[PDB]
Amino acid sequence: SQGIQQLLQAEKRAAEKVSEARKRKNRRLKQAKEEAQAEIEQYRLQREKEFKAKE
Amino acid sequence: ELFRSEEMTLAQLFLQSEAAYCCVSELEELGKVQFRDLNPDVNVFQRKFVNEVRRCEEMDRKLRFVEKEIRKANIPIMDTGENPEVPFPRDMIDLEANFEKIENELKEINTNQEALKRNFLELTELKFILRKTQQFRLGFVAGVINRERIPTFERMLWRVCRGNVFLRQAEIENPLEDPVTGDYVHKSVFIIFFQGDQLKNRVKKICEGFRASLYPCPETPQERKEMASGVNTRIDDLQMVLNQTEDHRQRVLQAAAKNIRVWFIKVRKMKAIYHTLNLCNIDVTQKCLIAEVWCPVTDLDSIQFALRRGTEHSGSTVPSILNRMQTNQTPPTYNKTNKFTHGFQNIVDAYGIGTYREINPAPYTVITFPFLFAVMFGDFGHGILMTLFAVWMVLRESRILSQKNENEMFSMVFSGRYIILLMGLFSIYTGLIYNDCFSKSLNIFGSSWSVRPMFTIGNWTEETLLGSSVLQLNPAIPGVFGGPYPFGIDPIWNIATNKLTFLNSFKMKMSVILGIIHMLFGVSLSLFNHIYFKKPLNIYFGFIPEIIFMSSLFGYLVILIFYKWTAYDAHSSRNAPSLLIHFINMFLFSYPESGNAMLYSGQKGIQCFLIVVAMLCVPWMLLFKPLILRHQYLRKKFDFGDTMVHQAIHTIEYCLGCISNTASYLRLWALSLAHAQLSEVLWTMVIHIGLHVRSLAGGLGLFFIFAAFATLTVAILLIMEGLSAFLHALRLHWVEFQNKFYTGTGFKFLPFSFEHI
Questions:
Q1: How far apart are CA B192 and CA B169, in angstroms?
Q2: Nearest by CB: A12 against B14, B285, B290
Q3: How far does B288 lie from chain A, in Å, by closest CA?
Q4: Which residue spans belong to the Cytoplasmic compartment (chain B)?
Q5: For labeling, which of B106, B346, B361, B684 is most exposed (least CB within 10 Å)?
Q6: Any idea what the Cα angle at residue B706 is, between residues B705 and B712, rounded to 5°?
């Protein structure tokens, strides 16, 4: 029966796509330490300028 | 069309889950489809709807529990109307909560009713105890018991406390109810007096021995009055609560006694729906439900409508439409039926279920089974009594359909009412042509029998004088004989002493002829069945040599029977040939050119020819089919051994059947004779006792004598010889007829329906 076979193929592609999305987003969660540093450097530079003004 | 097994259709469908319950229910409301089992692994925990069915299983037990309580209480279950299923939405949980509500209220309220009643009874005993004890270290005890125990109880007190116990007994003003059984019994109060705990223990041990109900008591009228005020308060309060407790139980029972009708329908349908859903499949990724069905080809539209409606009864939009299947195994076999046809299909199905598209015995059976029955069951009066019996079932039908079924005999005869009526009517027809009820004629016909004056013609006149002293035989000679007869059987053979010779010649030859005819119809049905299946080999190697074999053997016999009935007569009766002898000597080539005369010119040549022509058919049936099949399988590039086993068995059964099955129809004559004899004996041994020489003296006895006659003729003839003819005629169908054509192998089609509840 081709109708069920084609449906099973689409259901398999659907199960693959959600599983790949889970893996991609889990890798994005690990990137937080890379994206964080530019904000940390801006806070350091802001506090340096504030300290030099107070001096 | 019903002359053959109905055309089905295997279909596969994409059942949307939110429609699924609704669709299943609608299909079971239609009752014109069989689901395939698509879950070979189905089991109590493997089934996809464990919980849903298990909830139904428990809700059914809760229904049974509350119903048993209601039936013990004899509260009327209303049983009104007829109802749809529950919604697919989770409303079954509110229903389950309603089941729990009723159950918990019953268990609580029953326990309270019992406890409150028991307390009230004990306090009533205590009220009487306090009132009697008010007439009064030293001490005493008091209690109650069945009064008949008091004599033995008092003798035991002095037996144990050696000659020393003071006491008083007092019968209660009314009997009191037993707290467990509800038996009212004439109990009596007692009070017993003693010094110290040592005597207290003895009088108590005897009270325990007789199972007497002891109670504490205060020492003075004033302290007893204070206790009695407590008792009078408790007992009134208990009865007030108990009245309302019982009233509330009655509301709870009444609410449930409405609901059981509705809930039974809902639960049983729901259980069935989820059980059918458990036959479906759901693979691990699967969103919809895959399902498969057998439907009638005519009703493929009817189920598609039910699917669309099932979706429309739901929040779903998906119409769940089917594809027709092509890679099909042989479907289950279905036939539509009704009152005049259902029993006939059932007795056919009971030997075996026809192959898909196979010719159906049942429509031919609707006549031929009654016919064979009536040919055997050939009494006019029994035909009437059978007709009357079945008429009374058909006339009362609408009443009887409401009644009990637990009388299985009554269920069977009522379920046979249409078949029984038809055979009864045909048994009038056959019984009339045989001119016999109870070995009595009907005076409707004229006669070919000759009055005494016709024997007084100078010739044979002496025999009319001999008749005053000795038996005589009329040889049916011309001028004396009353001429060829135009009705059925001549009345005279009922009274004639030699009658059985004449009647046998008829019923034997008749039964033989009918048998040949029915077997020739069965092989004719084989051709039409092989045509519908488009099988050239089965016609060429089967039907053609088979019908030639049968016809060449059978045709001569029937032809010669008819020839004897035309070519011989009274003035040629002495030295006339035997029919049976010429048939045997044909089949065996064994005529010794002598003895019985040959009937017609060239008859020896015909005898030789027809037998040789039948013998020439055998190799086609036996072997040539297996040989061409072996070459076809070798060219088309199965077991040749098994092919020979099956084809040899079939060929042997047909060839030997042309002896045995040809003879088998003698059963008709056989039972017919038995029936006729039984009827004549049962009259002769009974009715003649009421045939006294005077009006009153005979007629009074004849009433009771005829009732014994009716009883015996019913039990023997109308019941048992009827059941004999019935079962024999079924056998004649199941083998001697059907074996020519009806394979009778297949699955019974089973429509899923609420009607199985």
A1: 9
A2: B285
A3: 10
A4: 1-358, 397-411, 526-543, 737-757
A5: B684
A6: 95
